[PDB]
């Protein structure tokens, strides 16, 4: 479970325990330019790796633009 907000969408998204950035972008039915997440907040530009790697976990919120 990730919550996903921005680019006109607001939705919890469920996905593989081991899941990967690509599969996340695919579950979001929107052109995604940037992702922001965690504390302190880190930024990703989407203009590949297992979500797990960057620090994203279940019950966490992703802000997209």
């Amino acid at each position: 479970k990730l919550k996903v907000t921005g680019a006109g969408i607001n939705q919890v998204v469920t996905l593989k325990q081991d899941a990967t950035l690509n599969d996340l972008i695919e579950h979001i039915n929107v052109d995604v330019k940037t992702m922001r997440f965690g504390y302190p907040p880190q930024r990703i530009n989407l203009q590949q790796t297992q979500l797990d790697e960057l620090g994203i976990n279940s019950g966490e919120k992703i802000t997209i633009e």
């Binding site: 607001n10 922001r36 504390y39 930024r43 019950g59 966490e60 919120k61 802000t63």
Partner: protein, 157 residues
């Protein structure tokens, strides 16, 4: 005993923009780490903050620093409501006034890359230079709150 009414407790983290809940309490509230939440205290006092989990915090308490407690006019031990803040927009412009240069020293490092939520009428403390300095938010556009973004204009008296 109403899951979303929480006892005000002390913060460990002195970030003005953050409040903290136990992970079991966040689970019970369907709240996500990093979500923007709306808090209500005294008398129509409100605040918008980012919610973090803290596995040292009691399920029934909320960690909130002095700056947030003063904005809510609450004291440690008081009871608060938390609910999700449905959509806070990025700020176009804010107007802040120092209390007794400010942009470079204080305001810009404070906001840069932090995406802080801010509300009209907030008083906030920024550290840097010699002394800490308090600012008041006179107005925000959109009002009455927004997320301070990199492209948010900062007007400082």
């Amino acid at each position: 005993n109403r899951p979303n009414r929480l006892i005000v407790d002390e913060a460990i983290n002195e970030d003005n923009s953050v409040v903290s809940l136990s992970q079991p309490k966040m689970d019970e509230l369907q709240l996500f780490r990093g979500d923007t939440v709306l808090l209500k205290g005294k008398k129509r006092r409100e605040a918008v903050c980012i919610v973090l989990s803290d596995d040292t915090c009691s399920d029934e308490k909320i960690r909130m620093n002095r700056v947030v407690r003063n904005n809510l006019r609450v004291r440690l031990g008081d009871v608060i409501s938390i609910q999700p803040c449905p959509d806070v927009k990025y700020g176009k412009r804010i107007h802040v006034l120092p209390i007794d240069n400010l942009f470079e020293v204080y305001l810009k490092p404070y906001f840069l890359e932090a995406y802080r939520p801010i509300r009209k009428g907030d008083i906030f403390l920024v550290r840097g230079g010699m002394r800490a300095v308090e600012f008041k938010v006179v107005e925000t556009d959109p009002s009455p709150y927004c997320i301070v973004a990199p492209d948010t204009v900062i007007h400082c008296e």
